[PDB]
């Protein structure tokens, strides 16, 4: 539904070299809304573009490393 | 106190051939042979540190 | 015989002694980081201060009671001390640079924010504030104490020394404290690393200034400055406003911009 | 420039020493380790 | 003082050129040699 | 007797002396790293077995070169000699303090040996750049001998720098301005000013990698919210300005040497000279970031560091043409030095244009970290530095020592190196453009051929050091006593005879105001 | 408000500081801390060129403002040129200390 | 790859290697004029007895010998700078790979709808197949669909290290916590080689890259096959 | 700037006790006063064992290898957590 991605699409946010504020921005944008959806009552499926993009972006071992500290406690991002 | 360096100038002046270093006395001397002990008994012992270093004990 | 102002000086053992000294220091440090020991690091501390302590005492025999600080020698160690503030002005720039860097791009480790998650800064209202105000003021009192000097008033340059000395040891007093009182540890990431470091060699420096104030005090207490030659004092108020300067751009910098 | 003649000239005889004493003080001990190098590496 | 002029005003002894030869070749020798023995010493520790 | 001379020394010919022996040594040390380098290379393969010690190698060639070998002769030793007597000076502003701004460089390189000698040694690059000097990949004693060689060597080179500054400012005759001292003193002054303001802030990058290493602090730890590429930042913006104090006593010298056996009174554009050198001293101050073009900058920052960078052959080149003019219409004097002063226009014009194409952002990204970097520098700095020193060495000798060497086996010497440094670097501007990486153990087996040739001109240079070695024996060993120097009018350092005695200038010389 | 107790230079200089300051206060120059004014340099109105001992090494910087200076022994007896521009320059021997 | 005795550069994979060539091409004559011009004078002004060594005007020379080289200048910089903002201009890819280096091997990553990923070793000397190519084979390739453009991210797991490949003009640092991101785009199909380009340790020499490119088609069996 | 006061006829030792007295002691006296107010121990925040902050790569050449230089119990927790 309004999607049919083949990568995320440049980004004027992020135009240079250093991509890993946009990998982080999706991330977080992602868990946010899937917060918001998930309490408010309603579907998560709003939140797929910023899942899809920042699965693209980000290395595994970030997102892994991410998804660790949220389940601990310790992710220093505001979510 | 009371200015005596003109008695100091008058010690420091005095024609005995003594590099300024020594030209204080006695403790000059003293002090000069402490300092040079301790920095080459210290090199000696860096040395022997380096020697202990360079080798691996497993 | 020369006739030339110049100062051909005696041949000296410091030079060596201090060389030493510096690689037992170095040496020592290693020692004590990786080899848990202290005993080079000692001995390096112990002969770096017999260096300068002897090193020093000559300059003042060689000028106090010598004579040999002709007008023209005299202009060339003032060169020479204002050649050596810059060098440590560009020694700070680098750390200055350091936290700059850190905290105009917070990465996603510290959360992506500065101050980083996490860290609780203190209130620069209150005790750095307080530092601020004494530093500024051991900077009045200092040109007062100078000024005493050149007016050929013992009295008041003394006062006003001894005032300008207290207040040093005030500000280490009151920053040490700080250090202990600070929630967070120079292991509390980039944060903890760039205060401690920059305000730590900033500490250090108000300690090395300090120390140079107390050497002139007792100079002038046993009278080897005279109304119109005096550039021991000289050279600790400039490296003394030098330490006021650094205290105020890490005061703006990392205490209240960084909060 | 112009120099005063030798003090102690340096003969042909001599030069021909000194250069091979000097070569030989480089080229040995280099030599010695890079002949030696195989019983270093597994030893 | 110290003494000036040609082969005066240097740490080393220029009297006899043999005596001499030996001294410059021990100097740079063993400038030159140190890295062989060090990568020596690097091969023989493991 | 000795102690007091060489040891508690306040003299600037003695100081400048120990300075050249030390240097010389350094140069031995260095050549021998040079030359296990090549070896390693010289066929495919692995040859040492231990890719670190290899590494380890590299590194400590990079130091000894340059930090004891290179500023110790070039302003310890040239300078310390030259300076004083250049401007009618009875010695240095501070006597003892110089005595201590060379006593430091030993104990500097014990620590650098140390370094090799402990654990698995520092295998990281002069630029020791981390994580890889980190703790982790580097745990033990060796970095941090490394950063206290450096620290130890930063002290002698700043305590250098405020007395040739304030020598060069304070002791001049009453009636010279600064637009009347040789162009050698203002070299020196130049450089001095770029140590003074480099130096700190690479002692303050290095004093982070320590803290880093031992201090649990975390500036070049992105887990901390640190990041290595500020270092990269703190390290060439020293890094740069220190490529060009390695060059700028040596255009002093070139600059002298020159004039002198081109049988001129004075170098043609003077003020276009001093101009020149502060130029370049200026804009060696904002360019650093051409050795950071692929860490991923802003293509806008790139931009502007291609440009800056490429500003600097403007007046580079009024140098360069300067002393062609300064050639021009000269009664030329075909001795030793004079050859090494032309080899070194040649040379150095060769790599300040390599460095040129480096300097395009666009290109770099392919050549950066190849061998075209690699033979970039080694004709600028290796061939740029080392000809300007062998010049100044062969032309000042007598002045030092009273001797004069056999001009002929000089001729020789210089005939055989111009050789050997040409065949051992020329190859690697092929191996650079076909993508062999620099800082390699080993290579595919394409590269076997240039590597192997150069490898072969590395020991054509072996042969010239070990020549030279023989040749300042032979002086030494011949006595043959200097009776006359032409041009002592425009070459003041010469007229207090060769050696000038102990103490000179006890009666400064008689300048007129006018 | 005010006092003393502070030493003066003329009641505490000593060694060459002192000798400099006294010489100075008599407007001589014995330590060679200004530079000499030129004379017209001619054979009758030669420079004079102080001198301690026999002979005295000479910078002559000919015209204004150029930056090559000519540099030369000068010695005890009939005045020297400057070998470029050919001034006068005499050496007027000994005495400083007395 | 590079062959014996090759004197420049890689033949160019991608347009942009291509307008580099062009670029080094018209730098390097500018650099043998230059260098040939100086040794030139040299020898000519070592050739004659004729002399003049009188003090000789300056400001007059100069200007030529300042204004020639600043146009010089401008003729390299012109080109130079264009290249550099047309490789930067936006291309919005078809497919992001990341790769990761770590001590001494890289890892790669194609996220974009499965979540494929798998290490990429040296093959070692010892089992090297006839015809291989000693220290830059590996034992799983970078396979890519060619005419496509594609967006590389690099970083780095544990120290330095740099991705590059020759033939397409690219080196792009690897850095621990940070990103890179590059365009890469094949005009052919075909293998690919590369060297990690920043000192990373004892094995900085042997972690090389290989980069295969086929059709489309191919690249999407691949894909299906390596999960 | 020019302040709000006024002299410069003539700055001299008078002016800058004056100064000092006057201005700085005074500043300092009244900095003193709002510091040891504002004071008083802040409750310590809960622990959370954050990844970028109780760095430990190497231990400390000093004590257990695990206590900063300027350790305050009270207010600086460990890796993992505050002691007893
Ligand atoms: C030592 C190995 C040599 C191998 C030679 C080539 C074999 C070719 C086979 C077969 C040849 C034909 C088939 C292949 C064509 C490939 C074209 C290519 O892809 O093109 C690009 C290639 C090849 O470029 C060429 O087209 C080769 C140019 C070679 C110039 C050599 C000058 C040599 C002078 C003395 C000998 C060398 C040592 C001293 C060098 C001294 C410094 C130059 O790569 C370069 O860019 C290399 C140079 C890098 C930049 C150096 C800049 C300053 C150089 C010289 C100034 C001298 C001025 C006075 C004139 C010279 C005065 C001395
Ligand atoms: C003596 C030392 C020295 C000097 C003087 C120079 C001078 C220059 N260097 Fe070099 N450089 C180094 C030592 C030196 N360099 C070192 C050590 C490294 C590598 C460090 C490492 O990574 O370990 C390096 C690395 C290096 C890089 C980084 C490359 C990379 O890592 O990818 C770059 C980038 O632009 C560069 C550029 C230049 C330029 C443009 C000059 C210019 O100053 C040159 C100017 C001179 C000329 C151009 C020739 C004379 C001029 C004329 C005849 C006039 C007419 C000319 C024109 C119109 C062009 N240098
Ligand atoms: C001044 C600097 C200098 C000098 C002179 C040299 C000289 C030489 N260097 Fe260089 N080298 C560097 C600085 C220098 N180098 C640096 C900065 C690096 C980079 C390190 C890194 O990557 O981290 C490097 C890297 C480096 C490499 C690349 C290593 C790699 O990437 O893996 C190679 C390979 O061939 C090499 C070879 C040589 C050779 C064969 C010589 C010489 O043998 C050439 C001939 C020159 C001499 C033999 C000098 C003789 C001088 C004297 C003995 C003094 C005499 C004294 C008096 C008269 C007073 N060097
Ligand atoms: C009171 C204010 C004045 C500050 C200095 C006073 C005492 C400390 C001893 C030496 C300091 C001198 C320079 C600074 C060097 C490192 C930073 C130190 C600043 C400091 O003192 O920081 C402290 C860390 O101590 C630490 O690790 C310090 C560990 C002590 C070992 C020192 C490490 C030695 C490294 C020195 C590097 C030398 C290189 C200098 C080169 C000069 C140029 C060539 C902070 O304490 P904390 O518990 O983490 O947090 C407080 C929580 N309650
Ligand atoms: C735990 C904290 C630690 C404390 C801080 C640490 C260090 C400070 C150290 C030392 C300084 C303190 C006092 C100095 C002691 C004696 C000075 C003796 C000389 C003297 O008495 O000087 C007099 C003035 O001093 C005087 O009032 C002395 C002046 C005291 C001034 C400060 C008092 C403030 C009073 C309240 C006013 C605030 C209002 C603000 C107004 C706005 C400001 C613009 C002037 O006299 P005279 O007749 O012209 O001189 C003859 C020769 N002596
Ligand atoms: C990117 C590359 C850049 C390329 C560089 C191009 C190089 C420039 C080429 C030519 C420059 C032309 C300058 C013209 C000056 C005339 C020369 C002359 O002849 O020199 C003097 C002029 O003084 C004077 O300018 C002083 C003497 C001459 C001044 C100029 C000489 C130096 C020229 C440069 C030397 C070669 C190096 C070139 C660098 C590439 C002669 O003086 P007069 O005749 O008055 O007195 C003699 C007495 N009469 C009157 C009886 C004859
Ligand atoms: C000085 C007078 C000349 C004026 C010319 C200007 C030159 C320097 C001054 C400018 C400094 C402020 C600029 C900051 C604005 C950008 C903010 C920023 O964000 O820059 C940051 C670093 O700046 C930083 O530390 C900047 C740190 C400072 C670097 C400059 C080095 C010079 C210092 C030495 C001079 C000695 C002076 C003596 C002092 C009295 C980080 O870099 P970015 O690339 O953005 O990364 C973000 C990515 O995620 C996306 O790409
Ligand atoms: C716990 C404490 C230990 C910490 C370590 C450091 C400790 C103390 C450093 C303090 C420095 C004390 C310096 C005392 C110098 C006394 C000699 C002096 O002041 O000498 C004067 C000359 O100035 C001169 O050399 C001026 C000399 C300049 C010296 C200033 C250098 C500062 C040193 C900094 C070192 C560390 C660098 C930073 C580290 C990152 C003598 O000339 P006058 O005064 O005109 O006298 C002549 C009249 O009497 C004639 O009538
Ligand atoms: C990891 C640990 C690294 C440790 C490295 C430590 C290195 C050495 C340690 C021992 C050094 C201390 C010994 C005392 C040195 C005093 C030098 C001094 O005071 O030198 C003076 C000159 O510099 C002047 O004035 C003005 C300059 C004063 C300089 C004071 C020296 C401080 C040394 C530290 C420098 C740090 C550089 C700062 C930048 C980062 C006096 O010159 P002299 O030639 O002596 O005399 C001339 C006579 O006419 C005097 O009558
Ligand atoms: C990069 C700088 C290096 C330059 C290359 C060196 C040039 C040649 C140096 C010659 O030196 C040697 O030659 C040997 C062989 O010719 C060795 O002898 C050895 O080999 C033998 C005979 O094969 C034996 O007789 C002895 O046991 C022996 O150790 C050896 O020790 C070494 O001194
Ligand atoms: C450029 C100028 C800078 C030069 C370098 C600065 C030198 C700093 C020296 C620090 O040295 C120390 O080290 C210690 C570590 O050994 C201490 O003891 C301590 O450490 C212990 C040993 O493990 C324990 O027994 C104790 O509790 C105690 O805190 C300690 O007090 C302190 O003096
Ligand atoms: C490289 C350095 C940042 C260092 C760091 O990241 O710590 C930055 C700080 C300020 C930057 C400069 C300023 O932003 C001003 C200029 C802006 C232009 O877009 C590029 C060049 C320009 C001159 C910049 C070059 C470079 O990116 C600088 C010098
Ligand atoms: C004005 C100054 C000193 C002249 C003097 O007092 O003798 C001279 C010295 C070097 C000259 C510069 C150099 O010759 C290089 C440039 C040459 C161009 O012809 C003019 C600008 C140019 C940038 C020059 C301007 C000016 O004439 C300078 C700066
Ligand atoms: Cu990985 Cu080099
Ligand atoms: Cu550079
Ligand atoms: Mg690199
Ligand atoms: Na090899
Ligand atoms: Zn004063
Ligand atoms: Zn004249």
Known sequence: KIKNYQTAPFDSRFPNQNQTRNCWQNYLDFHRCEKAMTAKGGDVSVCEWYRRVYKSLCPISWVSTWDDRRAEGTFPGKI | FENRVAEKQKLFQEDNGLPVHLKGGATDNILYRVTMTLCLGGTLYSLYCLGWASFPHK | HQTHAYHMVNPSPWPLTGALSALLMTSGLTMWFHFNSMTLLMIGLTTNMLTMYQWWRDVIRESTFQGHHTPAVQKGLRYGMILFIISEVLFFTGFFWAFYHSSLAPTPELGGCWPPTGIHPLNPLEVPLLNTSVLLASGVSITWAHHSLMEGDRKHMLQALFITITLGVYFTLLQASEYYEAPFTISDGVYGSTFFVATGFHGLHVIIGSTFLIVCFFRQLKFHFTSNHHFGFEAAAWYWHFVDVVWLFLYVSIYWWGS | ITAKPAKTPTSPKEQAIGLSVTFLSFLLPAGWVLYHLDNYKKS | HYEEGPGKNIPFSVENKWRLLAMMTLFFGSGFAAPFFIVRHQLLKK | ?514 | ?98 | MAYPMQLGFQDATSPIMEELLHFHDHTLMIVFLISSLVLYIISLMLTTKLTHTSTMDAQEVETIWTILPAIILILIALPSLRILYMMDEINNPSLTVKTMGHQWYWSYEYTDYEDLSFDSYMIPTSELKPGELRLLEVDNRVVLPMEMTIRMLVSSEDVLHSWAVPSLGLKTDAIPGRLNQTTLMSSRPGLYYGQCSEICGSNHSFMPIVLELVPLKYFEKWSASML | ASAAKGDHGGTGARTWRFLTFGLALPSVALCTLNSWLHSGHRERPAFIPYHHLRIRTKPFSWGDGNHTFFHNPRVNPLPTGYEK
Request: with cysteine; charged share 10%; aromatic share 14%.
């Open chain 6, 1 to 514: 007797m000795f102690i007091n001379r060489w040891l508690f020394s306040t003299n600037h010919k003695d100081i400048g002396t120990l300075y050249l022996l030390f240097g010389a040594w350094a140069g031995m040390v260095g050549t021998a790293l040079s030359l296990l380098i090549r070896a390693e290379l010289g066929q495919p393969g692995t040859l040492l077995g231990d890719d670190q010690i290899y590494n380890v190698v590299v590194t400590a060639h990079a130091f000894v070169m340059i930090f004891f070998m290179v500023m110790p002769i070039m302003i310890g030793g040239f300078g310390n000699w030259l300076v004083p007597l250049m401007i009618g000076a009875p010695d240095m502003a501070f006597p003892r303090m110089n005595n201590m701004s060379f006593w430091l460089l030993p104990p500097s390189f014990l620590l650098l040996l140390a370094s090799s000698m402990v654990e698995a040694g520092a295998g990281t690059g002069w630029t020791v750049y981390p994580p890889l000097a980190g703790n982790l990949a580097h745990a033990g004693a060796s970095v941090d001998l490394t950063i206290f060689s450096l620290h130890l060597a930063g002290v002698s080179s700043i305590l250098g720098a405020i007395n040739f500054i304030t020598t060069i400012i304070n002791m001049k005759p009453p009636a010279m301005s600064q637009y009347q001292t040789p162009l050698f003193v203002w070299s020196v002054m130049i450089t001095a000013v770029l140590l003074l303001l480099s130096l700190p802030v690479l002692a303050a990058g290095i004093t982070m990698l320590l803290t880093d290493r031992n201090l649990n602090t975390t500036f070049f730890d992105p887990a901390g919210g640190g990041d290595p590429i500020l270092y990269q930042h703190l390290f060439w913006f020293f890094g740069h300005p220190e490529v060009y104090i390695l060059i700028l006593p040596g255009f002093g010298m070139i600059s002298h040497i020159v004039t002198y056996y081109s049988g001129k009174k004075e170098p043609f554009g003077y003020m276009g000279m001093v101009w020149a050198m502060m130029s370049i001293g200026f804009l060696g101050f904002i360019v650093w970031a051409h050795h950071m073009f692929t860490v991923g900058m802003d293509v806008d920052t790139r931009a502007y560091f291609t440009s800056a960078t490429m500003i600097i052959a403007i007046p580079t080149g009024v140098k360069v043409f300067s002393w062609l003019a300064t050639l021009h219409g000269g009664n030329i004097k075909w001795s030793p030095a004079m050859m090494w002063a032309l080899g070194f226009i040649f040379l150095f014009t060769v790599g300040g244009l390599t460095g040129i194409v480096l300097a395009n952002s666009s290109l770099d990204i392919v050549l950066h970290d190849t061998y075209y970097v690699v033979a970039h520098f080694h004709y600028v700095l290796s061939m740029g530095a080392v000809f300007a020193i062998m010049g100044g060495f062969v032309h000042w000798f007598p002045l030092f020592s009273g001797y004069t060497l056999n001009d002929t086996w000089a001729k020789i010497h210089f005939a055989i190196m111009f050789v050997g440094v040409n065949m051992t670097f020329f190859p690697q501007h092929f191996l650079g453009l076909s993508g062999m990486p620099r800082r390699y153990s080993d290579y595919p087996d394409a590269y076997t051929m240039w590597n192997t040739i150069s490898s072969m001109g590395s020991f054509i240079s072996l042969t010239a050091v070990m020549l030279m070695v023989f040749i300042i024996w032979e002086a030494f060993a011949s006595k043959r006593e200097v009776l006359t120097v032409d041009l002592t009018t425009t070459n003041l350092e010469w007229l207090n005879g060769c050696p000038p005695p102990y103490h000179t200038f006890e009666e400064p010389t008689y300048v007129n105001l006018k």
């Open chain 7, 1 to 98: 408000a005010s006092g003393g107790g502070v030493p003066t230079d003329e009641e505490q200089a000593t060694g060459l500081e002192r000798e400099v300051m006294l010489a100075a206060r008599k407007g001589q120059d014995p330590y060679n801390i200004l530079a000499p004014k030129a004379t017209s340099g001619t054979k009758e109105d030669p420079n004079l060129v102080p001198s301690i001992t026999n002979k005295r090494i000479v910078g002559c910087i000919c015209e204004e403002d150029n930056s090559t200076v000519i540099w030369f022994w000068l010695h005890k007896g009939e005045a020297q040129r400057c070998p470029s521009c050919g001034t006068h320059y005499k050496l007027v021997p000994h005495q400083l200390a007395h």
